[PDB]
Amino acid sequence: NEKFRPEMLQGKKVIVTGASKGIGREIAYHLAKMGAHVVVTARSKEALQKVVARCLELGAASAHYIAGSMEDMTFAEEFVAEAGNLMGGLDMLILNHVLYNRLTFFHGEIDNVRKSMEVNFHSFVVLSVAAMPMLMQSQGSIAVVSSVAGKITYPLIAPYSASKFALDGFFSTLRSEFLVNKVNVSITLCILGLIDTETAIKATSGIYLGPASPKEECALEIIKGTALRQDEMYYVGSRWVPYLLGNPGRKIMEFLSAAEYNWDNVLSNEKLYG
Amino acid sequence: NEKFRPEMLQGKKVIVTGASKGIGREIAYHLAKMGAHVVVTARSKEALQKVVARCLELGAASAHYIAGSMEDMTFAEEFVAEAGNLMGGLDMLILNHVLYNRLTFFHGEIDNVRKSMEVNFHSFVVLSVAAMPMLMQSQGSIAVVSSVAGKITYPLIAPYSASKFALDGFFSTLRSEFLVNKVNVSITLCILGLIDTETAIKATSGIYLGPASPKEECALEIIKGTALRQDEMYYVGSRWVPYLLGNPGRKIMEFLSAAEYNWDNVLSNEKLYG
Ligand SMILES: NC(=O)C1=CN([C@@H]2O[C@H](COP(=O)(O)OP(=O)(O)OC[C@H]3O[C@@H](n4cnc5c(N)ncnc54)[C@H](OP(=O)(O)O)[C@@H]3O)[C@@H](O)[C@H]2O)C=CC1
Ligand SMILES: NC(=O)C1=CN([C@@H]2O[C@H](COP(=O)(O)OP(=O)(O)OC[C@H]3O[C@@H](n4cnc5c(N)ncnc54)[C@H](OP(=O)(O)O)[C@@H]3O)[C@@H](O)[C@H]2O)C=CC1
User: Cβ separation of A173 and B152 shorter than 8 Å?
Assistant: First the structure.
């Protein structure tokens, strides 16, 4: 476990959300080629059926889908339980689905804000909570798929960028707690630049003109970084960009701030209850 | 308009949320000493009443309170309209209320996550949307009260930190678009370190031991930065901390990314629709 080897996903039990098309579908493909057990989800029954059949073709140990909407928090919680049952456990939770709005100036569409927060952030939280016990018993891993727009802001897309930023605040804090605690569930935040997904290409078409990175490789890098158990994985179309997105200032401040807690109390209140 | 002068708030029409205690109450007092028109809100009717009477005493041009809960998006939208009518307009919207959770390791309390997102983030957005036409006609200003834990993560407090990070993703993008567009409503993100608020002193008591900055001055600095129309205002108990909080990387990458849009198309799509 220093360099990635495809063999590391052999027989591992993996959930992939938003896997009927785009990057998600690609993640399933690569996991199937590695011979992982795979449970795939999104809203479209027929699209997921195709992915499932393709994954068995490619050499998945097993492949199933459960269709539903990630704005229903009850489905999200119950999806994880079914997924565990079909696999007899869970090694990796790949949180990938997303709601995209139109690239537009914000004009007070508060329903876009709410829907984006529901689909892109709250459900990732619900999925993680439902999966935590299985991940803890397998010392497994969570991929939190985000965006450059979750580290930095871009005109158009405020609703989306709010939800992605929220992911960083929540999961980074969680990892930080897991580290002190010492939980042995790893959390990888994936910071992706523009990707040549069909929705993204259509979305950005007359609007944003920077180059797009390929989805097949993107999907691979997500699994690499999650398997290698990294805090962050950057796939952003350049080697110098990630240095400007990982602000060392925050790193230093988080480091400095830890010496400000009284760990004796914190750790013994935790053992008392909660 | 280069150095702050108390005169700049004289007769200005200001909403302050979460203003029955802590920093909010201090904001109302400072605005009253400057002779502003003030509408104050929070859930506690009797605590608000006291603050209003103190504000009139301290020299407010006028002072009123409307009590209600920022979990209720209907109240938030109707509060801004009533506030505007009491004052005949609005020059400054100070978004300060917050729900605090106990400082505890996260153990799957999804309701804390939901409620924090509701009170700390969604309501900020609803208030701003409701206020925007009055703010556009006055070319006014919004203060978005955040935290160091909205730029950086801290163990304990994950749900809170998600909400604060959300505010940065949302409002910073909003400012971006306002500059392009060219709206003339300023948005000041207030990054506060530890403040000697009663709630904060109780909350952190046996747990976090860093020094606390005074709420009276904190409240003043929030209004100076908002009146001076700053993108960001730092009040963090140190002069070098802000350097580590404002990632220059982010600013460079935002500046570079701008030249990546086709603004001709963006601006003409805006002009035809939306
Ligand atoms: N494409 C890019 O340029 C970038 C992508 N990313 C990130 O990568 C991830 C995937 O992006 P991408 O592959 O382009 O997205 P796509 O639009 O290609 O695919 C999104 C997937 O999520 C599913 N989905 C959408 N809405 C819901 C819902 N309400 N409930 C359940 N499932 C849903 C979709 O299926 P269905 O619609 O049938 O439900 C689909 O399977 C996201 O987290 C995104 O933020 C980050 C930066 C850039
Ligand atoms: N205090 C500090 O160490 C730090 C504070 N900040 C920021 O400063 C701001 C003020 O915090 P502070 O003075 O410490 O907090 P306080 O607890 O002192 O004040 C909270 C205010 O918000 C109101 N409020 C809480 N919940 C709701 C609700 N659901 N609906 C409407 N009003 C509500 C409270 O009254 P009621 O419950 O009666 O409604 C009260 O008036 C916050 O945004 C905070 O995040 C940032 C960094 C540090």
Answer: no
Domain boundaries, chain B: 1-274
Spatial separation of the C-alpha atoms in residues B9 and B140, rounded to whole Å: 11
Final resolution, Å = 2.5
A122 and B107: CB-CB below 8 Å?
no
Query: Is there an atom of ligand 1 within 6 Å of A195 CB?
Result: yes
Breaks (C-N over 2.5 A) in chain B follow: none
Cα A117 to chain centroid, rounded: 15
Confirm or deny that B246 is annotated as ligand binding.
no
Among this protein's residues, is A208 annotated catalytic?
Answer: no
Q: Which residues in chain B have their CB less than 8 angstroms from residue A246's CB?
A: 249
Tell me the two tokens of residue B125. Answer: 């957005």
Name which of B106, B125, B249 is nearest A247 (Cβ-Cβ).
B249
Residues A64, A39: Cα–Cα separation, whole Å? 5
Task: Tell how far CA B248 is from the center of its chain.
Answer: 23
Distance of alpha carbon B251 from alpha carbon A173, whole angstroms: 23
d(CA B100, CA B19) in angstroms, rounded, equals: 15
- Other beta carbons within 10 angstroms of residue B181's beta carbon come to 12
CATH architecture designation of domain B1-274: 3-Layer(aba) Sandwich (3.40)
- β-partners of residue A198 are none
SS3 B75: helix
Is B31 within any annotated ligand binding site?
Answer: yes
Give the angle B257-B259-B262 at the CA atoms, nearest 5°: 110
CB A13 within 8 A of CB A37: yes
Give rounded-to-5 percent helix, strand, coil for chain B.
55, 15, 30
β-bridge pairing A141-145 and A92-95: parallel
Q: Give the closest residue to B237 by CA, choosing from B221, B250, B252, B253.
A: B221
Decide if B29 contacts B58 (C-beta within 8 A): yes
Strand order in the sheet with B62-67: B62-67, B37-42, B13-16, B92-95, B141-145, B186-192, B232-235
Distance from CA of B151 to the nearest CA of A (A): 8
Both tokens of A50, joined, read 């195709």
B200 CA distance to ligand 2 middle (Å): 9
Residue B199: count other Cβ atoms within 10 Å of its Cβ. 13
